[PDB]
């Protein structure tokens, strides 16, 4: 089937540059206007750039602040986004999307942007940060239902995984999305609700794994 596949995302420092790629397959790439659209974590879709099939017209959203360049290599079925002057707020998933180009059931003659974007890639993630790799510190959230948990604090980059009792405890567990602190490090919490009557008797251990720093921690959580 017709598809687009983005690549090139990753971690970049503020002020730095990054080139994204998007390769199309099973259509005549040169016939279509192409777009970049981004989505910051937990936010909506933001269109950011457009290029016509023949490269003769480009447009950028004001949020680009004239820092990015859009280009294409039709011979390689490729669309690019060259990003410069990056800042933390450019952290997002970046999607490449093709113009539909017409309002007929099947589009043979391709126009412009007027009828939306009919093919989208899966996205590539860009994180802009000056933080260095760091494993978390794990602190207890000490406890007819009781709540207990673990606070997984000050790590970079994402992700961390949390299990309870080596995976044997799943009922009532909530592991929350991390928050990005003003320090540039992430923090997350994982909680579980259990019978209060189990507190003196059942052991509760949170198993934390931060693969980027090769940090594993097992924290036993008991009443204080």
């Amino acid at each position: 089937e017709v598809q687009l596949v983005e690549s090139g995302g990753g971690l970049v420092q503020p002020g730095g540059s990054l080139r994204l790629s998007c390769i199309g397959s099973e259509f005549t790439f040169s016939n279509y206007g192409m777009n970049w659209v981004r989505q910051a974590p937990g936010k909506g879709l933001e269109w950011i750039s457009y290029i016509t099939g023949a490269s003769a017209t480009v447009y950028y959203a004001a949020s680009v602040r004239g820092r990015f360049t859009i280009s294409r290599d039709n011979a390689r079925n490729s669309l690019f986004l060259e990003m410069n002057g990056l800042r933390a707020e450019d952290t997002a998933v970046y999607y490449c999307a093709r113009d539909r180009g017409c309002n007929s059931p099947t589009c043979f003659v391709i126009g412009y942007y007027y009828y939306g974007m009919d093919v989208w890639g899966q996205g590539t993630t860009v994180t802009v940060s000056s933080a260095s790799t760091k494993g978390p510190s794990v602190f207890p959230l000490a406890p007819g239902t009781a709540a207990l948990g673990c606070l997984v604090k000050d790590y970079f980059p994402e992700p961390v995984t949390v299990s309870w009792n080596s995976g044997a405890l799943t009922s009532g567990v909530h592991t929350f999305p991390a928050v990005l602190q003003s320090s540039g490090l992430y923090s997350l919490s994982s909680v579980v609700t259990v019978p209060s009557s189990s507190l003196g008797t059942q052991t509760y251990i949170c198993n934390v794994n931060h693969k980027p720093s090769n940090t594993k921690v097992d924290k036993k959580v008991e009443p204080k």
Binding site: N103, G116, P140, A147, L151, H174, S187
Partner: protein, 212 residues
């Protein structure tokens, strides 16, 4: 830029319900208006173009209407695969092509007040100079909720962060964790730490507190 005002931002539905979403443009855009669906963890897909024309493969229960400034997306009889976020997008004027803010369609259930728990900082954390105080709001519905932190009855602003889980697959509820961060030095200067929760399932706010 043309501004797109999409309403509502959050709608709950049951299988079989009709759903209506509106989009209003800040100036006329003729029929150059598109609708997209975005399922959790996936890229958007095009549903409707030219205000009312259905993209191939899109089921007939989806329909679009309008021209000029006022547009509507209707799902006639919602099915389980339709729980998702929907976006309008004007394609009349560039730059910027602009999207509405989105409509998150979640699963309807009965109102459920949160169970609220407060956690003091650990002694182990305090040793390195910072105190995190955590407030958990467990298994509530709907998602809208407010947490207010107080330290010796002083309202705290600017020094907390929170996050919310996705809707639970079994019981259709949400949970929320909020962290108040202060220095150990400040923590040890105050006594009463309180999290006050406002939520539709409660006719007055609920407070959980501890004394250091």
């Amino acid at each position: 830029d043309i501004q797109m005002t999409q309403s509502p931002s959050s709608l709950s539905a049951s299988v079989g319900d009709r759903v209506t979403i509106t989009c209003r443009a800040s100036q006329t855009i003729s029929r150059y208006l598109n609708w997209y669906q975005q399922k959790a963890g996936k890229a958007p897909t095009l549903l409707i173009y030219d205000a009312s024309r259905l993209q191939s493969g899109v089921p007939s229960r989806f329909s679009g209407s309008g021209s000029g400034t006022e547009f509507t997306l209707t799902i006639s009889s919602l099915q389980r695969e339709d729980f998702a976020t929907y976006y309008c997008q004007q394609s009349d004027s560039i730059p910027a092509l602009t999207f509405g803010g989105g409509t998150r369609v979640d699963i309807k259930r009965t109102v459920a007040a949160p169970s609220v728990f407060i956690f003091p900082p650990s002694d182990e954390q305090l040793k390195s100079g910072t105190a995190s105080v955590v407030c958990l709001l467990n298994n509530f519905y709907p998602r809208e909720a407010v947490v207010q932190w107080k330290v010796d009855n002083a309202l705290q602003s600017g020094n907390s962060q929170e996050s919310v889980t996705e809707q639970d697959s079994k019981d259709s509820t949400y949970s929320l964790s909020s962290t108040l961060t202060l220095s150990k030095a400040d923590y040890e200067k105050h006594k009463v730490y309180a999290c006050e929760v406002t939520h539709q399932g409660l006719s007055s706010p609920v407070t959980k507190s501890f004394n250091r």
